[PDB]
């Protein structure tokens, strides 16, 4: 009363109101934040949403600094939290959607989820790692996209008309045609009944049409990693009448490779078994390396792996923990102590079902993907400091100019001596910086 | 017939870039991801993968005068060796 | 699948390229040509790259792009890296363009520079069209 | 001049310079052209990524003896 008319009481009062708001920020954005999970990450933070919420509607009632304050350091703690893809909660946001939306492991209602989901707008002002979000995004979309992570398309996609609005755009549209695309998976399925009827080989249950359009680019990363492959002979036809019905479709992009839609084919084949195991992709592909020899080295393996070895740890731990492999080692590949028999034992409920356990596991994979965000956020910060200095000082020379662009950056990190051509390129484009006569090098400055 | 792993259902790989280079209409990088300055400033029927991408008879498929641009820098114009466009 | 590098598909492509000429059958060797032309950028075997080069020009005469190809026979055997003998055969392919390309100021110029060519002092044509170096 | 400022090209050649503390940089151009031969126009003045007026004093964005007026400018001159 007094210090709003006394006036400036008030902003005291809102002063170290940011500072508990805030230091309590510190700590309790520290404190129950030790698993780094959506309910805790998510909810610690939108647990004070519920704080000020019901602080701030309440007596509270106006001083709009305070607005402005709680949405300050609110904001500024949605830059300030564990990561650095501190849309991790976001992330969790999602990965909320990946462990919520799924219609049957964590299944609830629309509009039972949506309000959680409209609270997540209600932070929709503040998830703040939209891309950092829709590279992570698109990995969470590899444990979403044939997955099931994310049951309420329609719920994620208003949440892409606010991201579109104040957000990300295609990243959007990209899974738009990824839905449509997988649409079209069915329906070549049922076209390549229609059309080839390919009786190629007998057995022509489930080769292949499963097709999710994301852009070649709007990948995180490069492809769910492939390498060679039996690939009989209906697969061969899958991929080519496809590019039949596909390459009359497009072209550029086509029938590619990509293990990671990949799972086991382990069933009725002549099996003392009743048994049907299926696996993870390399759980299959390195399973199709033991197949008919009843025993296999590492380095009977090593002839054909030209590949990684982790594919088969996995293998030989599902193998033996069910009791399929008559194995030596559960080892990455196998140790050239040890081989590679299929064993007829299993240990889960059914026919030989739920041996299907990839790992499913990355703390070393976590790392892996890490790297991919620190080349496209020093890009962004070279190519704004790149321009501003192109504006400054027309250099401006190819050779001399990069040399010098290296001075000015010493400290940063080894570039790469050539892509100098492809470095004044870049600005070319822009209407930053423009190519002279004069020389290869030596351009001038342009706008 | 208990074990040789025969043949079960199987699912596919598809994409869907395109049946060309095309690299962003070169002669700048307003993209061809993007409708670049001058293009913007013209704007056919232009996206954002081909702002203007294809295989054409330049094949150069660069921007209306940024394809005129780089035109300027050679009036022999051997982007993709056919007259900007 | 396979990968090769660029100099066995290249090998391919100027193959195909200068057989269809000698089948004549321009087009086709012109959609894998302009296949080909891109790569101009990565590999630095300036010997096939001129090969390729080469059979580009050859293209453009049998495509009736004449002056293009006269740049490029003119301009090419100006160097003395090649056999001389196949300087002096594209000298004529270029100085054959520029009589097989159009009246130009280009080919003025260029004329001009075939009238301070040396080179074709040796040759029969080069009176011929040193005649109308001043536009006989 | 009163004011002994630096004009500094993109690769960083700082120069020292007498003008004043409402000394024009549109005249200042005139005095780094005058110095080095590179002409001001590619000389572009550009302070904390934003350019600095062609026409205005240097004293106008707070600039002082090590400050820095931007080219980006050319080689030829120099
Ligand atoms: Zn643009
Ligand atoms: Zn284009
Ligand atoms: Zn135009």
Redesign the pocket.
């Given at each position: 009363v007094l210090l709003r008319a006394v006036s400036t009481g008030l902003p005291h009062m809102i002063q170290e109101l940011q500072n508990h708001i805030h230091d309590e920020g510190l700590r309790a954005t520290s404190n129950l934040t030790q698993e780094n999970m959506p309910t805790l990450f998510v909810e610690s933070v939108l647990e004070v949403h519920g704080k000020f919420v019901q602080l701030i509607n309440t007596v509270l009632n106006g001083d709009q600094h305070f607005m402005s304050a709680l949405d300050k350091a609110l904001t500024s703690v949605v830059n300030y939290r564990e990561p650095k893809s501190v849309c991790k909660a976001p992330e969790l946001l999602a990965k909320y959607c990946d462990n919520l939306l799924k219609k049957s492991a964590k299944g609830m209602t629309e509009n039972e989820v949506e309000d959680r989901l409209t609270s997540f707008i209600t932070v929709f002002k503040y998830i703040d790692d939209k891309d950092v979000f829709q590279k992570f995004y698109a990995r969470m979309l590899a444990k979403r996209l044939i997955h099931g992570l994310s049951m309420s398309m329609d719920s994620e996609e208003a949440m892409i008309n606010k991201l579109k609005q104040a957000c990300g755009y295609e990243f959007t549209s990209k899974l738009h045609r990824m839905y449509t695309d997988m649409s079209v998976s069915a329906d070549l399925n049922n076209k390549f009944n229609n059309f080839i009827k390919n009786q190629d080989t007998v057995i022509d249950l489930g080769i292949s049409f499963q097709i999710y359009v994301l852009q070649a680019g709007a990948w995180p990363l490069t492809q769910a990693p492939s390498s060679t492959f039996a690939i009989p002979q209906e697969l061969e036809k899958s991929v080519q009448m496809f590019e039949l019905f596909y390459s009359q479709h497009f072209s550029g992009r086509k029938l590619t490779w990509l293990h990671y839609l990949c799972t086991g084919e382990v069933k009725m084949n002549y099996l003392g078994k009743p048994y049907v195991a299926m696996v993870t992709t390399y759980q299959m592909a390195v399973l199709l390396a033991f197949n008919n020899s009843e025993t296999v080295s590492y380095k009977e393996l090593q002839d054909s792996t030209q590949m990684n070895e982790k594919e088969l740890t996995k293998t030989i731990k599902s193998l033996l923990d069910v009791k399929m492999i008559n194995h030596d080692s559960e080892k990455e590949d196998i140790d050239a102590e040890s081989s590679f028999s299929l064993n007829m034992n299993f240990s889960s409920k059914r026919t030989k079902f739920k041996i299907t356990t990839s790992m499913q596991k990355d703390t070393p994979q976590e790392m892996e993907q890490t790297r991919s965000a620190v080349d496209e956020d020093r890009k962004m910060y070279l190519q704004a400091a790149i321009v501003r200095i192109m504006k400054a000082r027309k250099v401006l020379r190819h050779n001399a100019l990069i040399q010098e662009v290296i001075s000015q950056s010493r400290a940063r990190f080894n570039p790469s001596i050539s892509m100098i051509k492809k470095c004044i390129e870049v600005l070319i484009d822009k209407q930053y910086i423009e190519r002279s006569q004069a020389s290869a090098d030596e351009y001038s400055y342009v706008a | 017939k208990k074990k040789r792993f025969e043949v079960k259902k199987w699912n596919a790989v598809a994409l869907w870039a395109w049946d060309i280079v095309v690299d962003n209409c070169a002669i700048c990088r307003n993209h061809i991801m993007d409708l670049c300055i001058?293009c913007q400033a013209?704007q056919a029927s232009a996206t954002s993968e081909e702002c203007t991408v294809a295989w054409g008879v330049c094949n150069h498929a660069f921007h209306?005068?940024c394809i005129?641009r780089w035109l300027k820098t050679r009036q022999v114009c051997p982007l993709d060796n056919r007259e900007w466009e | 699948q396979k990968q090769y590098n660029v100099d066995y598909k290249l090998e391919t492509y100027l193959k195909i390229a200068r057989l269809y000429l000698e089948d004549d059958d321009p087009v086709q060797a012109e959609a894998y040509i302009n296949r080909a032309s891109l790569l101009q950028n990565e590999s630095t075997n300036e010997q096939l790259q001129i090969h390729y080069k080469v059979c580009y020009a050859r293209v453009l005469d049998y495509r009736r792009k004449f002056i293009e190809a006269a740049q490029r026979y003119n301009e090419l055997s100006y160097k003395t890296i090649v056999h001389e003998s196949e300087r002096l055969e594209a000298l004529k392919h270029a100085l054959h363009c520029t009589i097989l390309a159009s009246a130009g100021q280009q080919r003025s110029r260029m004329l001009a520079t075939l009238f301070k060519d040396e080179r074709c002092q040796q040759l029969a044509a080069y009176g011929i069209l040193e005649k109308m170096y001043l536009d006989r | 001049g009163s004011m002994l400022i630096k004009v500094k090209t993109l690769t960083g050649k700082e120069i020292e310079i007498d003008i004043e503390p409402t000394d024009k940089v549109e005249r200042i151009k005139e005095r780094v052209e005058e110095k080095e031969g590179i002409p001001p126009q590619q000389q572009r003045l550009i302070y904390s990524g934003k350019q600095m007026n062609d026409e205005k004093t240097a004293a106008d964005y707070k600039i002082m003896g090590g400050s820095v007026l931007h080219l980006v400018l050319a080689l030829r001159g120099g």
């Amino acid at each position: 009363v007094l210090l709003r008319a006394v006036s400036t009481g008030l902003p005291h009062m809102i002063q170290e109101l940011q500072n508990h708001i805030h230091d309590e920020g510190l700590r309790a954005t520290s404190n129950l934040t030790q698993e780094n999970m959506p309910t805790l990450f998510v909810e610690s933070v939108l647990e004070v949403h519920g704080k000020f919420v019901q602080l701030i509607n309440t007596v509270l009632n106006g001083d709009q600094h305070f607005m402005s304050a709680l949405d300050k350091a609110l904001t500024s703690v949605v830059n300030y939290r564990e990561p650095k893809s501190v849309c991790k909660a976001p992330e969790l946001l999602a990965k909320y959607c990946d462990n919520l939306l799924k219609k049957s492991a964590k299944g609830m209602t629309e509009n039972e989820v949506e309000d959680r989901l409209t609270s997540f707008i209600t932070v929709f002002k503040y998830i703040d790692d939209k891309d950092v979000f829709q590279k992570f995004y698109a990995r969470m979309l590899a444990k979403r996209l044939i997955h099931g992570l994310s049951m309420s398309m329609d719920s994620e996609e208003a949440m892409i008309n606010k991201l579109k609005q104040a957000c990300g755009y295609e990243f959007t549209s990209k899974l738009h045609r990824m839905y449509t695309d997988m649409s079209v998976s069915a329906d070549l399925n049922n076209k390549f009944n229609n059309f080839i009827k390919n009786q190629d080989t007998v057995i022509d249950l489930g080769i292949s049409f499963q097709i999710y359009v994301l852009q070649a680019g709007a990948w995180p990363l490069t492809q769910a990693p492939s390498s060679t492959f039996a690939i009989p002979q209906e697969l061969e036809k899958s991929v080519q009448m496809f590019e039949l019905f596909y390459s009359q479709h497009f072209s550029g992009r086509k029938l590619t490779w990509l293990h990671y839609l990949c799972t086991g084919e382990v069933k009725m084949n002549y099996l003392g078994k009743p048994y049907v195991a299926m696996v993870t992709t390399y759980q299959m592909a390195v399973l199709l390396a033991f197949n008919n020899s009843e025993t296999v080295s590492y380095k009977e393996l090593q002839d054909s792996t030209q590949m990684n070895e982790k594919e088969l740890t996995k293998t030989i731990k599902s193998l033996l923990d069910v009791k399929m492999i008559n194995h030596d080692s559960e080892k990455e590949d196998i140790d050239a102590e040890s081989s590679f028999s299929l064993n007829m034992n299993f240990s889960s409920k059914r026919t030989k079902f739920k041996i299907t356990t990839s790992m499913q596991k990355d703390t070393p994979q976590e790392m892996e993907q890490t790297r991919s965000a620190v080349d496209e956020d020093r890009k962004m910060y070279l190519q704004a400091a790149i321009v501003r200095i192109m504006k400054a000082r027309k250099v401006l020379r190819h050779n001399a100019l990069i040399q010098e662009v290296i001075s000015q950056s010493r400290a940063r990190f080894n570039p790469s001596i050539s892509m100098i051509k492809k470095c004044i390129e870049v600005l070319i484009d822009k209407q930053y910086i423009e190519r002279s006569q004069a020389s290869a090098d030596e351009y001038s400055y342009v706008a | 017939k208990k074990k040789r792993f025969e043949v079960k259902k199987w699912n596919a790989v598809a994409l869907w870039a395109w049946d060309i280079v095309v690299d962003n209409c070169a002669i700048c990088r307003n993209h061809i991801m993007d409708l670049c300055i001058e293009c913007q400033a013209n704007q056919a029927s232009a996206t954002s993968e081909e702002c203007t991408v294809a295989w054409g008879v330049c094949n150069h498929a660069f921007h209306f005068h940024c394809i005129s641009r780089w035109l300027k820098t050679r009036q022999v114009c051997p982007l993709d060796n056919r007259e900007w466009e | 699948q396979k990968q090769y590098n660029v100099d066995y598909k290249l090998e391919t492509y100027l193959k195909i390229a200068r057989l269809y000429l000698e089948d004549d059958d321009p087009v086709q060797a012109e959609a894998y040509i302009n296949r080909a032309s891109l790569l101009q950028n990565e590999s630095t075997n300036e010997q096939l790259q001129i090969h390729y080069k080469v059979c580009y020009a050859r293209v453009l005469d049998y495509r009736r792009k004449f002056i293009e190809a006269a740049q490029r026979y003119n301009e090419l055997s100006y160097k003395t890296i090649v056999h001389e003998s196949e300087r002096l055969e594209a000298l004529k392919h270029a100085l054959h363009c520029t009589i097989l390309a159009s009246a130009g100021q280009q080919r003025s110029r260029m004329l001009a520079t075939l009238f301070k060519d040396e080179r074709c002092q040796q040759l029969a044509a080069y009176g011929i069209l040193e005649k109308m170096y001043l536009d006989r | 001049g009163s004011m002994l400022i630096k004009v500094k090209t993109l690769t960083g050649k700082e120069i020292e310079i007498d003008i004043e503390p409402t000394d024009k940089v549109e005249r200042i151009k005139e005095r780094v052209e005058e110095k080095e031969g590179i002409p001001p126009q590619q000389q572009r003045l550009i302070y904390s990524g934003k350019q600095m007026n062609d026409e205005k004093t240097a004293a106008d964005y707070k600039i002082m003896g090590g400050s820095v007026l931007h080219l980006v400018l050319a080689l030829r001159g120099g």
